[PDB]
Amino acid sequence: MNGTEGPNFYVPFSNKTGVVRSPFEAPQYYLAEPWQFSMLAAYMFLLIMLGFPINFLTLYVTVQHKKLRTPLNYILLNLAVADLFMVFGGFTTTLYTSLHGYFVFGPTGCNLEGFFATLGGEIALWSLVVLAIERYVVVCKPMSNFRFGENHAIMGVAFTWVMALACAAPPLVGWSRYIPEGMQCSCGIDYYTPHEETNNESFVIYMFVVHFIIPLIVIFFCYGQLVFTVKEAAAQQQESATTQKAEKEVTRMVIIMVIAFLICWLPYAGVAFYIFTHQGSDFGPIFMTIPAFFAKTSAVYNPVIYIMMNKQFRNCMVTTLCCGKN
């Protein structure tokens, strides 16, 4: 039957040979070779060594460069903090547990690690949505006589916190649950076992619709409007070479952002949708890690796209890293 059930876990390995152990008690070297756990640790190490400096530096240059402290940049800082929740809530813990071959922190740690890693990922996600909305409002100007200020920026950040809690908190109180996933060294939402006692099915649907489809629709609408607005402005002002450059660059960035978003969440959405549609099927531990791979690595390529490729942040970072040199 391809799996072994337990009170707070599901090991994706059959116990017909009697070798399966609780992922909170003993190494899982029967569902993956030791060297594969080492490569899990290696990748977590890579994500920490890249993810922490780039995201911490985002916060650090904002402290040193006052021009960065603008309301429109608040949500970018929110992103940086969210990624750091992924780095220390998830990546460092998984580095430690993978080197043991199982989740040594037990069920309590599983909820802790699961909550903060999910919280971090969801704040980042809704930050990308809020950013699109703010950019849409500012550039396309759907409202007359409106000026985006500090108060609007604070609401936007608070909104991401609330939406993220709307996803991360329910598994702590009975709607779905946190259990070890894949190689059983990191914990996450149970979107793949039919656990009616916590009503997993309805939560996965809620996730898919509210925390994937809706963000996708909003980001597409907002950045679609933005591209149209800039395309239209350039068309009505072809004598301006700069406006033509702007249109090219904005279109390029919008494509990069849209593609990066899909790369991050489509695997999870795809796998969840498949398991939902095809319930009663075998899913390997390495297979479950694939959507996690794409989603977690966003802690590195999102700040590259949203901070490093941002001219204001990039210049300030270069100045800071090169000791005052422009």
Binding site: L72, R135, V139, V230, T242, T243, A246, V250, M253
Partner: peptide, 11 residues
Amino acid sequence: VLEDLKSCGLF
């Protein structure tokens, strides 16, 4: 439209 784009870090 350029100043709004610059304000958003888009250009």
